Design a protein around this nucleic acid. Structure first.
Lengths: 159, 292, 222, 169, 124
RNA sequence: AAGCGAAUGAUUAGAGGUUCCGGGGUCACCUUGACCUAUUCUCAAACUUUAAAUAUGUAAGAAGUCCUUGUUAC
RNA sequence: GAAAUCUCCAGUAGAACAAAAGGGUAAAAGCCCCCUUGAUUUUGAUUUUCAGUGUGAAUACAAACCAUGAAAGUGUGGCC
RNA sequence: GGUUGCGGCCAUAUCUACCAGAAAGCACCGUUUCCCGUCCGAUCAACUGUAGUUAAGCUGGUAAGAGCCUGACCGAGUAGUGUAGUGGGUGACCAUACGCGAAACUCAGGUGCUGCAAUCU
């Protein structure tokens, strides 16, 4: 018949990467997780105790609980017309810090830093990010750079 | 022996310190991991190692990017404390065990309390936390790849450290002088090991029986003319000396590290460059095809 | 059972279904010999390389390759002898086609259910081909060229769809263009290996490069 | 040349075969106990072939290993029966070699009743000082090619000892 | 393979000395049966056999066994001038070649030439 | 998608190399029965190094950032 | 004797892990050896199936008491 | 700059051959009273750093080295794919427009990097 076991359709999600099988590198247990940290979920298949369900692999959510060897992660979940809250028992072997949040955090220190000097001199320090603006005008010189012409190449079998 | 490309292409080398064999990562996972409700409280490891002609015991906390050392009291420093001839025996491990204990306690501000055991009978007396006082510095022994075995030197340092006040969790099962009928360590026998009685009794029994082995061996002893029963004195004198001043100083040194680098650079084999790598192949291609 | 017409299995409708441990009970391919002609000639003996290339994406039934192979051999052999060419059937019959076995006897509606559990049993093999993939490759001396093209033309007629006779610029079955292979063969980086040739790489242990290719080092030095 | 690159006697392993089990293993073990002075072990059959009446873990073989000056001495007294000469065969590509005899019971000491007659097998295992590098628990590594053992060094090493010549056939 | 724990001796004749003596002097240390045989007279019956043996011994150097000579006279004695040589002995078929050793010295030749195939009973 | 001169599975063609664990033809005698190595062709839904496009998680703050020092049986 | 047992070398796992397949495992999750019963008690929370119901299975814990280990730690049944 | 103890990233570190190693250190190495363990002081354990020693191990270097890691306007804007068309094509499929864009291949490099502590001509 049909099976929907706790770990079905995971032939490749819990495979250890090529030449990355075996022991988990020891920095994993050394990273410190504080309630409020934003972490993602990448279940290294080697550690079998405390694996997440295959739906959460890649889902990024905050940490709400910190335990002896596990941490509690909150993940929003698509169920019908509403998002549910899913509190997960996750061994730290399957998680890592999200590098997206730290980029925002270091930016905040950068925003605070440049606003600090803006307090002294140079008001209107333009805190907000700017997307890629349309490129301004420029002069394209031709010293030694005469535009060399091109012609479409005739079809050749090349076989 | 003439391996193919497939073996080399898909070979997963274990972590470097396992390739060299010096590090056991299976234990290290459960020696460096921390109860996460103790977020940034580093776990201290009493690392004990046995090079030949020395003993290395350390207190190490494993941070993210490596391991920092509180204090590292090797055994080739016991000459400044008094023990000179014999730097690996069971008594030497116990002496450096108490040394690395007192050194860090005097470093972390707990010298005044936790005096360990002053009169040492080698009893399994763990340093209980003093009422209304800071808890004893709890360190965890990390023997390494060596084998747990009754009467081992690494557990000699273990008993030495705990007897120095540095509360390290352990049990009396693997101490020397163990009885399989009664689960107790013989105080007379264990303290004999502490003062190096096992070495001393071996010497005096050799001197009783023969002269050749007693003379070919222990010829460090012969220079200073110290009796077998005089070992307890020098060990006890050094034990109090270690208690007196374990603060440690680095050796005076000669030829400052700049001279160390300068002289080592000349003898150290250097590495060629790509132009030189391409230069010499011309010699080899000329030699192997020059009218050959 | 009578063989189903090839019109049914023309297209690449189904995903590949090769012989494996999940595909146990299958007959064997009709085509067994893939290299014909003077197959053991050296590379230089047959400079010209001609390809019969499919211009479309369909399935060549295994036995259609065998059917065209006998015809391509037979005109070529009788026109320029046995050993004037070497043809290689590049594509291979790995796709196993399925047939739903049927009863067409009197009142077979009773004993058979129709489409319930209608997973088909293995019917044969076929070669999956896409656009531009070579079907047949003949290599021969250049004067033989009219014969091999016409011989390939007779073989084209056993195949569904449209195929093209392309005169490849490569030197025989090698991956090198004619003018620059001549430079390579002249410079002496080429040792035959029964039917094909070995190339000297600028990378490798020079002692082994010397072992296989002494003439290159002599040619440069001289 | 270099003193510890010289070959030295490291282990001699002595094995037999006894298809069945019972009192024949007692005599087949008391022969080695009196001979080597140390009790051997009875290796258990890993598999069952049924072509020999042997079942799994039947202790069908008695073997012992001897090292040190006793090993050389029992080899010295073990090459008298081999006439301190040997075949070019019996030499492994890794520098080990061996041979098998058919009786040592009244060859070693006076025969005592209920011990019988058994054939005994030798395999000399030679390599050079420093073999601990592949046997220590910590920092286990390998040995250099100059430190390896081949047929060339051992046959040469087998010449100046025992006044022996190889390829007797 | 000649020198073992103890070099075998025949009737008080050392192994190395066992390699030296001729035919005539062996009758002193020979049993009566073989002694009577020689006493009645060995009249050139082994001589033609005995001369080709020396030809084979000289033509064969070390590193290999001497060429297998052959005969039928089961009645011949083991004589020290056949020592260290291999001979096949006729039995009806398929000559069986035996190396002659000093511990073999003085016996007959017919104890090797098994003229009858040993009888095997049972399933086989 | 791509890859098999990369793992497993298949696969066409050859080229070069064996213990007395088979010369089947004169005893070690060229001796056709191997596997191993460097190539060559074509593959794979229940193979894969690698690996898109689309789709997909989170973040883009005032419930935040920084500083000072109070509670706790943790 | 191809295949009885011994010895050595190469051995990225081509073995084994009760049982289907897959994933995972090298001083091990494999083979051997020692001790043991945590395959225990109280409940609660969480994940999958999902109505965020139950059953089943599982993860993390806490209060306990034990087991092992020198210890860290691991263990609330079977590597998943 | 070398060594050791503990390491972080986990082949740029691996693998196969050859060469080199001052001082220190490492190791090999020497011996079995006690502890401990094994068929076997080979493993382990103890003890001497004493008899020696670079032969190893280890470290570094060498290879038009395999491999591994980077890049490349090398392949290739290729294959593929999102969107659209009253586009072509009998169909199979293909081209086009707006986008994204590989992998193999080839070439050019590189062969560990550091962290704590002690030590070394």
């Amino acid at each position: 018949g049909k099976s929907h076991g706790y770990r079905s359709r995971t032939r490749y999600m819990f495979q250890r990467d090529f030449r990355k099988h075996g022991a988990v590198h020891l920095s994993t247990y050394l990273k410190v997780y504080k309630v409020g940290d934003i972490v993602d979920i990448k279940a290294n298949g080697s550690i079998q105790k405390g694996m997440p369900h295959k739906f959460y692999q890649g889902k990024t959510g905050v940490v709400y609980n910190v335990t002896k060897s596990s941490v509690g992660v909150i993940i929003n979940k698509m169920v019908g017309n509403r998002y549910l809250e899913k509190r997960l028992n996750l061994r730290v072997e399957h998680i890592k810090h999200s590098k997206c949040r730290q980029e925002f955090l270091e930016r905040v220190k950068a925003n605070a830093a440049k606003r600090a000097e803006a307090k002294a001199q140079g008001v209107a320090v333009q805190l907000k990010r700017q997307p890629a603006q349309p490129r301004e005008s420029r002069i394209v010189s031709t010293e030694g750079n005469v535009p060399q012409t091109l012609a479409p190449v005739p079809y050749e079998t090349f076989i | 022996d003439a391996k193919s490309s497939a073996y080399s292409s898909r070979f997963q080398t274990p972590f470097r310190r396992r390739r060299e064999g010096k590090t056991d990562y299976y234990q290290r996972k459960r020696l460096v991991t921390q109860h996460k409700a103790k977020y940034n409280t580093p776990k201290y490891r009493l690392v004990v190692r046995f090079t030949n002609k020395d003993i290395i015991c350390q207190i190490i906390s494993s941070t993210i990017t490596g391991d920092v050392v509180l204090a590292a009291a090797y055994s080739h420093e016991l000459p400044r404390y008094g023990i000179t001839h014999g730097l690996t025996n069971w008594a030497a491990a116990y002496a450096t065990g108490l040394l690395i204990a007192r050194r860090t306690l005097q470093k972390l501000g707990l010298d005044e309390t936790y005096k360990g055991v002053e009169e040492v009978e080698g009893e399994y007396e763990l340093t209980e936390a003093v009422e209304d006082g800071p808890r004893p510095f709890k360190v965890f022994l990390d023997i390494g790849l060596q084998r747990t075995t009754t009467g081992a030197r690494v557990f000699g340092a273990l008993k030495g450290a705990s007897d120095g006040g540095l509360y390290v969790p352990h049990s009396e099962n693997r101490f020397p002088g163990w009885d399989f009928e009664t689960e107790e360590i013989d105080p007379e026998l264990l303290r004999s090991y502490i003062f190096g009685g096992h070495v001393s009794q071996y010497m005096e029994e050799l001197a009783d029986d023969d002269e050749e082995r007693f003379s070919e061996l222990f010829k460090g002893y012969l220079a200073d003319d110290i009796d077998a029963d005089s070992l307890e004195d020098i060990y006890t004198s050094a034990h109090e000396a270690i208690r007196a001043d374990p603060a440690f100083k680095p050796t005076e040194k000669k030829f400052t590290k700049e001279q160390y680098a300068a002289e080592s650079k000349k003898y150290r084999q250097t590495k060629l460059s790509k132009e030189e790598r391409a230069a010499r192949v011309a010699a080899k291609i000329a030699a192997l095809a020059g009218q050959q | 059972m009578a063989r189903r017409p090839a019109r049914c299995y023309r297209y690449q409708k189904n995903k590949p279904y090769p012989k494996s441990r999940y595909n146990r009970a299958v007959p064997d391919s009709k085509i067994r010999i893939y290299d014909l002609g003077k197959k053991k000639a050296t590379v230089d003996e047959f400079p010209l390389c001609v390809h019969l290339v499919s211009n479309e994406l369909e399935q060549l039934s295994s036995e259609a390759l065998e059917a065209a192979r006998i015809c391509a051999n037979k005109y070529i052999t009788k026109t320029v002898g046995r050993d004037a060419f070497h043809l290689r059937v590049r594509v291979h019959p790995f796709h196993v086609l399925r047939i739903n076995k049927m009863l067409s006897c009197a009142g077979a509606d009773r004993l058979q259910q129709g489409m319930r559990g209608a997973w088909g049993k293995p019917h044969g093999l076929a070669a999956r081909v896409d656009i531009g993939q070579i079907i047949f490759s003949v290599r021969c001396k250049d004067v033989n060229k009219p014969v091999v093209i016409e011989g390939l033309r007779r073989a084209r007629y056993k195949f569904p769809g449209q195929q093209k006779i392309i005169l490849s610029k490569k030197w025989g079955f090698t991956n090198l263009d004619r003018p620059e292979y001549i430079k390579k063969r002249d410079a002496g980086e080429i040792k035959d290996d029964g039917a094909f040739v070995k190339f000297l790489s600028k990378k490798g242990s020079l002692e082994k490069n010397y072992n296989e290719f002494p003439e290159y080092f002599q040619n440069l030095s001289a | 040349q270099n003193p510890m690159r010289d070959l030295k006697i490291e282990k001699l392993v002595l094995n037999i075969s006894v298809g069945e089990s019972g009192d024949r293993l007692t005599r087949a073990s008391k022969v080695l106990e009196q001979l080597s002075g140390q009790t051997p072990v009875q290796s258990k059959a890993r598999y069952t072939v049924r072509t020999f009446g042997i079942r799994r873990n039947e202790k069908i073989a008695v073997h012992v290993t001897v090292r040190g000056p006793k090993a050389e001495e029992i080899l010295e007294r073990g090459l008298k029966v081999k006439e301190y000469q040997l075949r070019d065969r019996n030499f492994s590509a890794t520098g080990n070699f061996g041979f098998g005899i058919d009786e040592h019971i009244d060859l070693g000491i006076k025969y005592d009743p209920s011990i019988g007659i058994f054939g005994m097998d030798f395999y000399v295992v030679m390599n050079r000082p420093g073999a601990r590098v592949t046997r220590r628990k910590r920092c286990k590594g390998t040995v250099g090619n100059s430190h390896k053992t081949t047929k060339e060094d051992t046959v040469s090493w087998f010449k100046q000892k025992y006044d022996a010549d190889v390829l007797d056939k | 393979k000649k020198r073992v724990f103890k070099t075998h001796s025949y009737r008080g004749v050392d192994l190395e000395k066992l390699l030296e003596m001729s035919t005539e002097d062996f009758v002193k240390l020979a049993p009566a049966r073989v002694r009577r045989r020689f006493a009645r007279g060995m009249t050139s019956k082994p001589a033609g056999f005995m001369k080709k043996l020396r030809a084979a011994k000289l033509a064969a150097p070390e590193n290999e066994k001497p060429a297998p000579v052959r005969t039928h006279m089961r009645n011949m004695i083991i004589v020290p001038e056949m020592i260290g040589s291999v001979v096949g002995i006729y039995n009806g078929k398929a000559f069986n070649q035996v190396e002659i050793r000093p511990e073999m010295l003085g016996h007959y030749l017919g104890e090797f030439s098994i003229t009858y195939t040993p009888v095997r009973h049972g399933r086989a």
